[PDB]
Each structure stands twice: as structure tokens, then as C-alpha cells.
Design an enzyme around this catalytic site. Structure first.
Site, PDB file in Angstrom:
ATOM      1  CD  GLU A  25     -19.787   8.108 -14.302  1.00  0.00           C
ATOM      2  OE1 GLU A  25     -19.222   9.076 -13.752  1.00  0.00           O
ATOM      3  OE2 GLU A  25     -20.200   7.112 -13.673  1.00  0.00           O
ATOM      4  N   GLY A  26     -21.535  10.546 -17.952  1.00  0.00           N
ATOM      5  CA  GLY A  26     -20.977  11.754 -18.519  1.00  0.00           C
ATOM      6  C   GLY A  26     -21.006  12.876 -17.507  1.00  0.00           C
ATOM      7  CB  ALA A  27     -20.279  16.492 -17.968  1.00  0.00           C
ATOM      8  CE1 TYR A  28     -23.722  17.722 -20.359  1.00  0.00           C
ATOM      9  CE2 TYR A  28     -25.988  16.965 -20.488  1.00  0.00           C
ATOM     10  CZ  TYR A  28     -24.835  17.414 -21.103  1.00  0.00           C
ATOM     11  OH  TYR A  28     -24.811  17.556 -22.465  1.00  0.00           O
ATOM     12  CB  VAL A  31     -25.450   5.279 -20.327  1.00  0.00           C
ATOM     13  CG1 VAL A  31     -26.290   4.616 -21.423  1.00  0.00           C
ATOM     14  CG2 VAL A  31     -24.825   6.563 -20.802  1.00  0.00           C
ATOM     15  CG  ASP A 141     -15.216  14.013 -26.726  1.00  0.00           C
ATOM     16  OD1 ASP A 141     -13.962  13.937 -26.821  1.00  0.00           O
ATOM     17  OD2 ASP A 141     -15.818  13.876 -25.641  1.00  0.00           O
TER      18      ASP A 141
HETATM   19  O1  4VF Z   1     -23.678   8.959 -24.574  1.00  0.00           O
HETATM   20  C1  4VF Z   1     -22.881   8.240 -23.977  1.00  0.00           C
HETATM   21  C2  4VF Z   1     -22.977   6.792 -24.177  1.00  0.00           C
HETATM   22  C3  4VF Z   1     -23.977   6.053 -24.706  1.00  0.00           C
HETATM   23  C4  4VF Z   1     -23.470   4.673 -24.590  1.00  0.00           C
HETATM   24  C5  4VF Z   1     -24.080   3.382 -25.086  1.00  0.00           C
HETATM   25  C6  4VF Z   1     -25.168   3.366 -25.959  1.00  0.00           C
HETATM   26  C7  4VF Z   1     -25.634   2.117 -26.387  1.00  0.00           C
HETATM   27  N1  4VF Z   1     -25.045   0.985 -25.956  1.00  0.00           N
HETATM   28  C8  4VF Z   1     -24.020   1.018 -25.094  1.00  0.00           C
HETATM   29  N2  4VF Z   1     -23.456  -0.145 -24.689  1.00  0.00           N
HETATM   30  C9  4VF Z   1     -22.394  -0.222 -23.683  1.00  0.00           C
HETATM   31  C10 4VF Z   1     -22.320  -1.639 -23.047  1.00  0.00           C
HETATM   32  C11 4VF Z   1     -21.107  -1.744 -22.092  1.00  0.00           C
HETATM   33  O2  4VF Z   1     -19.878  -1.399 -22.756  1.00  0.00           O
HETATM   34  C12 4VF Z   1     -19.918  -0.041 -23.252  1.00  0.00           C
HETATM   35  C13 4VF Z   1     -21.014   0.054 -24.336  1.00  0.00           C
HETATM   36  N3  4VF Z   1     -23.542   2.207 -24.663  1.00  0.00           N
HETATM   37  C14 4VF Z   1     -22.259   4.744 -24.018  1.00  0.00           C
HETATM   38  N4  4VF Z   1     -22.007   6.009 -23.813  1.00  0.00           N
HETATM   39  C15 4VF Z   1     -20.745   6.533 -23.293  1.00  0.00           C
HETATM   40  C16 4VF Z   1     -21.062   7.760 -22.412  1.00  0.00           C
HETATM   41  N5  4VF Z   1     -21.935   8.711 -23.120  1.00  0.00           N
HETATM   42  C17 4VF Z   1     -21.841  10.158 -22.914  1.00  0.00           C
HETATM   43  C18 4VF Z   1     -20.452  10.688 -22.455  1.00  0.00           C
HETATM   44  O3  4VF Z   1     -19.486  10.313 -23.441  1.00  0.00           O
HETATM   45  C19 4VF Z   1     -22.835  10.596 -21.827  1.00  0.00           C
HETATM   46  C20 4VF Z   1     -23.563   9.665 -21.075  1.00  0.00           C
HETATM   47  C21 4VF Z   1     -24.463  10.093 -20.087  1.00  0.00           C
HETATM   48  C22 4VF Z   1     -24.623  11.468 -19.849  1.00  0.00           C
HETATM   49  C23 4VF Z   1     -23.896  12.398 -20.595  1.00  0.00           C
HETATM   50 CL1  4VF Z   1     -24.034  14.117 -20.274  1.00  0.00          CL
HETATM   51  C24 4VF Z   1     -23.018  11.964 -21.590  1.00  0.00           C
END
Ligand code: 4VF
EC number: 2.7.11.24
Length: 330
Positions: A25-28, A31, A141
Site C-alpha cells: 500500500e501507499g499514501a493514496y 496493491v 524513494d
Molecule cells: O507501488 C508500490 C508497489 C508495487 C509493488 C509490487 C509490484 C509487483 N509485485 C509485487 N510483489 C509483492 C509480493 C509480496 O512481497 C512484496 C512484493 N509488488 C509493491 N509496491 C510497494 C508499494 N508501492 C507504492 C508505495 O511505495 C504504492 C502502492 C499503492 C499506492 C500508492 Cl499511492 C503507492
């Protein structure tokens, strides 16, 4: 079937994407992993809801435009984008990405890395970073939870929300006063791979400066011979002397070559800090360095309009437009 709900967040991504599971997840946004019944694999789906805030709209448009242009093995891409059929209905955007197994944050919570693994992970971080910086883009970041990993130790950098043309990984310049901020972050991540603990875990701004000084020692006059926040400068000058701690004392079992590179990445003065090509060419990475196999951007990235001036309603229009080609009937 209806939309699925994950930890309070509704995900309207069916029927193509189903069986959703929280992965971040993130600020807004949030995932999830999901099953793609077209490509018959699981994918990552990043939901974002940025439209109430001008800054979040800026970030969303940059992230989409940058990731759609970038193509690199060590960088997360965008495969699909879902949003509502009309702009009045669009409150969320779903960005579909390749699904990775884990991240360096989780890995470092549970596993001790061998020197060879540290070396190989560092190499891929820097190989990806070389491509980003060659496009004149800063990530801003980099941190272990934004470094994704596969079963086969392949590494990809994700989360380009803050990308432009987190406290523990924050370069000193940012706090006191460019590509060198990313190098500082990579240095922090290298240190954390060597010891399984963050090197500068400050609880707040001042505390962050204090941890950095605790290791590097008091900054020199030339280190302070720069434009600098008056409050920060007065604070630093109010402190007693701090001695430099040798790297090999902090990391007694580390490869001396790794510690030489760490010293050059975690240099206080950004102008004296090592740059990405020089880091790739450092003796520590000799086993993996392969400039014939390290792609750079065909041209530098730049935006046509500048988004900081645009009202959030106008930014929404641009996001609606940018995402149109993923819509059926386009
Ligand atoms: O963009 C991402 C993101 C994409 C993925 C990702 C993508 C593909 N595979 C996996 N596998 C996972 C399988 C389990 O273990 C971890 C890896 N994860 C992980 N994150 C970390 C959070 N965010 C950012 C915030 O930093 C974010 C997210 C949502 C909303 C906002 Cl506003 C910002």
C-alpha cells in the site's frame, strides 16, 4: 460476480482480474495480486485514488508517463491500466504490473545474505539506476521495500510515484538544502544488506542528521560551504565534535571492496559522491559489470507541460487521456 474488497478497499477490476490478495500500500492506494484469466498468470494491481489532491495527480501522471516510456529488465513496467469509462466516474486508477515474489525489505527481515548475493543485488540496483539516470530521471524513494525480487534473484525497482526529471534513506542535502540523492539511498541499502539493519534509523529530522554524523563525523567547512538552511546550519554548528567511525569497525565481516564503495556512496558532500557509472565500474562489482549489456535511455525524458502549475481538474483530464489507449474500442 461483483467487485472484490480487500482490507476495506474495493477493487473493480473484474472480470479479467480475480481472486485478489493484499500485497502492499501507499499514501493514496493499495496493491493486490490477482489472477489474469487472459495471460493465465498472477499479476500485481496497484489501485490509486489521487484526484482530490493536486500533488497526487501530478505524481500519478508522472509515474504513468515515465513507466510507459521506460523499458528495462531491472525496472517495473505497466502492462494494463483500468479506469472508469467517463471522467466524471473516474475516482480510481488501477495500474497492472508484473507480479514479483517478494521485496528486499522482507528478505532482509528473514535471511542473511552472502557476499555474492549482496554483490549481485547491488549490481542490478545500479544497472537499473543507470538506465533511470541516463533518461535524466531521479527516482527519489529508493529503499528496500521498493526493490522487488523473484525466485531466481532477479531484481526490479518499483514505485515511481516520486520520480522527477523516506527518512532513513534520505540524503543529507535534502534536509540541509539531483541524481546524487539516489546514490545516497543505494548506499544506505548496501549498508543494510551488510548488517540486516538500517544504518541511519532516525526517529525524526534532527535525529536523522545525528545518526549520520555519528558515523561520518562532523562535516568539514567545505562540507558546509554550500547553500544551506539557516536553522540546520545553526543546529550543526551548535553540536559538539563527532569522530568519524571507520566502516570496517561498523561492518567487521564485510568485503573490504564493498566497504570502499560504501564509503564513496555515503559521502556527505553530494559533489564528491560517486556517480552510477563509476559505481558500476568499482572493483567490488567486477564479477558482474558488463557495459556491453547495460542499456541506457535513447533520449532524456521531459514533460511538455509542467504539471506543478496545472489545477487538479486539468491533471485529471490529462490522466484520463493518457490512460485512454488501454480502453476497449480504442
Ligand atoms: O507501488 C508500490 C508497489 C508495487 C509493488 C509490487 C509490484 C509487483 N509485485 C509485487 N510483489 C509483492 C509480493 C509480496 O512481497 C512484496 C512484493 N509488488 C509493491 N509496491 C510497494 C508499494 N508501492 C507504492 C508505495 O511505495 C504504492 C502502492 C499503492 C499506492 C500508492 Cl499511492 C503507492
Amino acid at each position: 460476480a461483483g467487485p472484490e474488497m480487500v482490507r476495506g478497499q474495493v477493487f473493480d477490476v473484474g472480470p479479467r482480474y480475480t481472486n485478489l490478495s493484499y500485497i502492499g500500500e501507499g499514501a493514496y492506494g493499495m496493491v493486490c495480486s490477482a489472477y489474469d484469466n487472459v495471460n493465465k498468470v498472477r499479476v500485481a494491481i496497484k489501485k490509486i485514488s489521487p484526484f482530490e489532491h493536486q500533488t497526487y495527480c501530478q505524481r500519478t501522471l508522472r509515474e504513468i508517463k515515465i513507466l510507459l516510456r521506460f523499458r528495462h529488465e531491472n525496472i517495473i513496467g505497466i502492462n494494463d491500466i483500468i479506469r472508469a469509462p467517463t471522467i466524471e466516474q473516474m475516482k480510481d486508477v488501477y495500474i497492472v504490473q508484473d507480479l514479483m515474489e517478494t521485496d528486499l525489505y522482507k528478505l532482509l527481515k528473514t535471511q542473511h545474505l552472502s557476499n555474492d548475493h549482496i554483490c549481485y543485488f547491488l549490481y542490478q540496483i545500479l544497472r537499473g539506476l543507470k538506465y533511470i539516470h541516463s533518461a535524466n530521471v531521479l527516482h527519489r524513494d529508493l529503499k528496500p521495500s521498493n526493490l522487488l525480487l523473484n525466485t531466481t534473484c532477479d531484481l526490479k525497482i518499483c514505485d515511481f510515484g516520486l520520480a522527477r526529471v523516506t527518512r532513513w534513506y534520505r540524503a543529507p542535502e535534502i534536509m540541509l538544502n539531483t541524481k546524487s540523492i539516489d546514490i545516497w539511498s543505494v548506499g544506505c541499502i548496501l549498508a543494510e544488506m551488510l548488517s540486516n539493519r538500517p544504518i541511519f534509523p532516525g526517529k525524526h529530522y534532527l535525529d536523522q542528521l545525528n545518526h549520520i554524523l555519528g558515523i561520518l563525523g562532523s562535516p568539514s567547512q567545505e562540507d558546509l560551504n554550500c547553500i544551506i538552511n539557516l536553522k540546520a546550519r545553526n543546529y550543526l554548528l551548535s553540536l559538539p565534535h563527532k569522530n568519524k567511525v571507520p566502516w570496517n569497525r561498523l561492518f567487521p565481516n564485510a568485503d573490504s571492496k564493498a566497504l570502499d564503495l560504501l564509503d564513496k556512496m555515503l559521502t556527505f558532500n553530494p559533489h564528491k559522491r560517486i556517480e552510477v557509472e563509476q559505481a558500476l565500474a568499482h572493483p567490488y562489482l567486477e564479477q558482474y559489470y558488463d557495459p556491453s549489456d547495460e542499456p541506457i535511455a535513447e533520449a532524456p525524458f521531459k514533460f511538455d507541460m509542467e504539471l506543478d502549475d496545472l489545477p487538479k481538474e486539468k491533471l485529471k483530464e490529462l490522466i484520463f487521456e493518457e490512460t485512454a489507449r488501454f480502453q476497449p474500442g480504442y
